[model samples]
Target: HGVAMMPGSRTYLCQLDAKTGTGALDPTNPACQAALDQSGATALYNWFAVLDSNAGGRGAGYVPDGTLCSAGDRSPYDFSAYNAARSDWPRTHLTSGATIPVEYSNWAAHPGDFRVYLTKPGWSPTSELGWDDLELIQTVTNPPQQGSPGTDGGHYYWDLALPSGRSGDALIFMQWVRSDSQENFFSCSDVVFDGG
Candidate 1:
């Protein structure tokens, strides 16, 4: 679930500016680099770790509040760094009430339903992400997918219509649940809505 933004994906943002060579995490986006430098490149992979190893998919009740971005789990990889409420993390700008194409990197090639949610209006970025602050907007199940599932550009994609009343900063939450297996993937995409 690498972040797909206006300028580039999260990997592109973190690797493009650095341009040192492969196997490096030199990022030009100060916010992006700051996160990488603090969390290490390994944490970068935290973009798509399935908490509970998918666990037949759990939401609302299974995952507690204030840790949705990190799936509320810190074992094996400490994602607490990314959970920090910050103003400088790489952000995606989008228009309110617009139809947008959404892509989730199928980094592991798991076919599942992607439940897309957005932070409720009036939510603040300064606070920890809480479930009560979000509302489920869409559920895309096995939409047409392109590219290899395990490759860098691999992904599952579909068009989503953003809520018309939205304005300002918010978190796009998605839960990927595999139909074939119990595995599930959770991700939090940062976005800013303007011109409401």
Candidate 2:
């Protein structure tokens, strides 16, 4: 005769799977957290998804992604906390004497063309910072061909020179310009000094 198993007494089983695949690793699990930490996965404050071209793409607009867009600046979503913890990542450090490098990647060719913009905090795309101070960091003309990877794909990186006396977080705006007009991708990221 065999004894019956008790309720809630089953052995727990953990599995290793693809990081991006569902039913693989549970994000909330401690083991998953350890793996992510070991892999140097830094939490990016802001990210934007925009069309690569105007005529044929995702559309003529910029869309924000990541924690900043999801959390309204409080609790677990606090920008300050995220920034502090991110300092441990290799690419997250920014020395005051050195230039702050920002990067953009376009693997998708939806929309017409895209560009990146930088503005001061609390400044709208229609404001002066949105007009004159707005620096066009990068732009893409033709998108990758259909069913092809990195065909028209490209990545751009820029070292933004921070203005003197400027400190704290700044608003990073991304714009998607199609054949018609443009739209704002209101994204923000923080920059801290390390005594250059």
Candidate 3:
């Protein structure tokens, strides 16, 4: 429930540490900078707790298009900035069909199910992310975790085989549902498959 790490090499936009004093990001990174300039750092780290609690767990319907990453303006947390749909956010490079280790922060360990979804073929990062644009690629419940989520290199990770025969940029969507409560979390990991 603290700073989160997406698949892409993005900094956990935590509390203001720079001149902004509100935890704005480094302008050196355009995408990252845009997020900070658009929204406060709180939204970057707490993008998870932004869902419709009343929606139960049916996030696909409750969460609207483009807002999937931020879950919209769920008071106490705002992700509208993250839903900018900019194509310049940091990205992780990998090969198609490569089985890579996937990790996400678990600041507060709780029994939950983590589902990884990917955009369907023909999807483009130039636009907003939508439910119809994604396909559930993997699902693991109560996965093994290590270290404190907020601490450096601490996260919940597992081996995942990237989709085969694909290239270009794509988005990896994560949905975490806690067994203890309907409190679910959503995150977006931007990635590029180097398959020319």
Candidate 4:
């Protein structure tokens, strides 16, 4: 029911960049444009819905490799295009060891555990993302929320501390495992570690 907003998940950022006030898409970013061309506009329009209804907290072989960004492409929506390996996707910049405010959409509030994962240093953006390439960094359960549910401003919020000594480009993958149902949400956020 949600996706990362602080670092901006791939689907969320693509939708942000491509959405037009005229109710159409106009992607300016090349990678986003390619994704749009492949998956069409519906996927971007439903950016906050990158989820698997039967995920059941499974990972690795269950979800398969190279499709982590699209939640193994088992969702009703066609987010497979987001699994593309590209370095030019929209990215966030942060200090290596900084603690940042993390926000995830609260389209429909649900009790869950938010698992945050980060790519190990030396991982390249040009390669596909896999479970083996990431390490769990944080796990928050039933965090507090702000604004109202079903609204764009509504989201679950928390302070996330970045792993120290991380540098260069990295991908922040988040999984929301619902405690009350088999549904789970997945997100991939591109980021750069710049000294501040």
Best by TM-score: 4
User: Which prediction has more favorable TM-score, 1 or 3?
Assistant: 3
Q: Which 10-residue span in candidate 4 carries the lowest summed lDDT?
A: 147-156
Q: Write the per-residue lDDT of candidate 1 for residues 1-196, one digit (tens) a residue.
A: 4433222333334444555656565676676677677666776554445345555777777777776655566335655555667666666788898888887776666566878888898986778787888899999888776788667667777898888877888878777778887656557666889744
The predictions' CA RMSDs to the true structure, in order, are 3.0, 15.5, 3.3, 0.8
Question: What TM-score should be assigned to candidate 2?
Answer: 0.35
Tell me which residue pairs clash in candidate 1: 54-183, 54-184
TM-score, every prediction = 0.83, 0.35, 0.84, 0.98
**Best lDDT among the predictions, by candidate number:** 4
TM-score of 4: 0.98
User: What is candidate 3's lDDT per residue for 1-196, written digit by digit as tens?
Assistant: 5223646323343222223555443445577777777786665555335454544466666778788776545536666776777778777787889888877777666787787898887788888789999999998887787887556557887788888988888888877777777667767777888853
Note the residue pairs that clash in candidate 4. none
User: Which lDDT values do the candidates have, in the order given?
Assistant: 0.67, 0.30, 0.68, 0.92
All candidates in order of TM-score, best leading: 4, 3, 1, 2
Pick out the ten consecutive residues of candidate 2 with the lowest summed lDDT: 1-10
Please write out the lDDT profile of model 2 over residues 1-196, one tens digit for every residue: 0000000000011112123444333444443244344432322211222112222223112221232221222222222222222222121224444455544343333344434444443443222222444455546443333233233224333445544443433334344344443322222232334335
How many angstroms is residue 27 displaced in model 3 relative to the true structure, after the best TM-score fit? Answer: 4.0
Residue 13's lDDT within candidate 1 is 40
